[PDB]
Amino acid sequence: IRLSRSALGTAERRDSEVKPAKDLADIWRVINEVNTINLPTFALYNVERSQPFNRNIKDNTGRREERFDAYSQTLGGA
Amino acid sequence: MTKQYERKAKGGNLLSAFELYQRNSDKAPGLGEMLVGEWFEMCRDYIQDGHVDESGIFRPDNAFYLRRLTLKDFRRFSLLEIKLEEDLTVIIGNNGKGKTSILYAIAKTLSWFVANILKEGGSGQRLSEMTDIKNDAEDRYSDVSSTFFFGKGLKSVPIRLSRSALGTAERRDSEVKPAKDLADIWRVINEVNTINLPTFALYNVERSQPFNRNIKDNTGRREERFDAYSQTLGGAGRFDHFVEWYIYLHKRTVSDISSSIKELEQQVNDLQRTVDGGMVSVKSLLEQMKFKLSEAIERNDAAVSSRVLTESVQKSIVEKAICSVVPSISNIWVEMITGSDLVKVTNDGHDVTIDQLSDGQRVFLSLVADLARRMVMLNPLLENPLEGRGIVLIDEIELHLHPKWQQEVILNLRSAFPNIQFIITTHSPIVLSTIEKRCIREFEPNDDGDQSFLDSPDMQTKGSENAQILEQVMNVHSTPPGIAESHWLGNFELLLLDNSGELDNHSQVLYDQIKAHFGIDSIELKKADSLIRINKMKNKLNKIRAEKGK
Amino acid sequence: VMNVHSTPPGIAESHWLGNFELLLLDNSGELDNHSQVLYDQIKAHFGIDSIELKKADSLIRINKMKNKLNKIRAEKGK
């Protein structure tokens, strides 16, 4: 998988080659929906962690109980 | 009534002189101008007197700093009393030992000073209900005590911040009256005639903001002298405010007033002659700029009457403060890229912007830049505004800093800001290696808050080895205890000591695996070889002694 | 690995052991006025139980008896 970007004000724009990642994640998602499987975990813990306080707002964001809530803001840094 | 006040004021007291000035302020003026001004030019001199030492650093005659702090039932501390150094105090300990709580309490105490400096009879921050009162405390209340020092005239100004818990008979009240008195002195002396005010800054863990490229346009609030007190004791410094102020300085340096006031005068001269004959319609709706001319005349005398430094001079001072403290930064300036003005720096010979800066460099840059801006804005009467009074609290001074940078983070800060009392907390022994032993307050590993005083370490940390400071001061083994390979040298030493000294199979296999793991010329192998050498020589000496006689 | 000194280089007290090495090896390995002054400074700053003073006194002991043995050997080598 290759991520590519061109600078501002450039006539020629470079594209990204992200198809194999889509294929692998499609395999994971389709197999999981047909029959439950174990899904990989992708997390990023950058400097944006260590923020003060906890449970700032009620955070109406999508029912933490459901399984695919584990991928929400998983690579945000905090 | 006034005889004792007159006698005491000549002896070196400002509070009595302040009371005399306040009491004679509302009396009959003119005939009593000399007597009321004599107290003014004794209270103002107390805050303004100072000499330049042999090192070329302005040393105030009367320094302002906090002497001792007492915490009673405040969080994990049942009763803790702390004595603080005049220049630099370092608080060290394990996690959850209350180091952050001490800085938080000092910031809350300084909040009242800041508030009463800003507004007449202002109210500072006061303790929390939910999290500040000690749990399982039989009194359900807490208080913090401060004993600031402002020269021989004010040897002690006790400050008490107190609070009760959720549900009590008597609500404990504060004793912020001396802080109000001192800040009232500062404010009214400044308002009668501009003086230098102390800077109180708190830098918490929450100073690692990722920075925003979008900054609000300069409305004018970032150039007021009383803007260095905005969110100063609030954790993160206002780096966006610094960026706006720096861009303002760049714009006013590249534009200046001598290239605009003369143009306004020329336009007025042309238009007035044009409207001389009549038809003043070309000036009735053009009178707005003629009145804006007088408006620009105002707010400009304040730049000459308050003895503020030139904007170019302020820019140069801030730039040289930033570059001489941050190691990677070489120079900093503003460019008009695609119209908007943005700040660029020089990191390791490259010209990245602020948003491209790493978190380690950006946080330290923001800290030093905010401190320099606040000192420059609050100290307009000094040749070097960085040599001004103040108390700055920094939590985790080594945050996001490489060990190479930790060896020079204290010396640079002390050199840039000589007259600020720094109260810091650290987790690194590399920083402690550059700090005097007298400046360190330590929490014992076996401490649940029942202790009453913070002692200095027994070993001199300044100029010491990192391993020695890790062992004696921080009680950390040089090698990791949880790694099996870290005990091989001691096991080899014991297995060679109990044996006759010859390398038997048990010692030989351990030596071989030590060689295989650490390497051919690791320190462990050299130490093992030296132990073999000394054991062989000791055996030789014992054999010689046995052969000498029976 | 970190490419960092274990002892800070910007501290004047860090080079005191090396300075003592120089001022001790200069004449024959014996103490004199400036060497004794530097030893007193090391003792007062680092302390009595500090490893710095232990290294300094071990160095003094080694050098004094090295000088004695050198004189003994030079006596018979003439």
Ligand SMILES: Nc1ncnc2c1ncn2[C@@H]1O[C@H](COP(=O)(O)OP(=O)(O)O)[C@@H](O)[C@H]1O
């Ligand atoms: N109100 C309280 N009552 C009792 N213990 C508390 C209270 N507030 C905090 N603590 C404890 O005291 C410590 C506070 O941590 P902190 O002041 O940040 O110390 P450090 O900065 O050294 O990590 C933690 O161990 C916490 O559990």
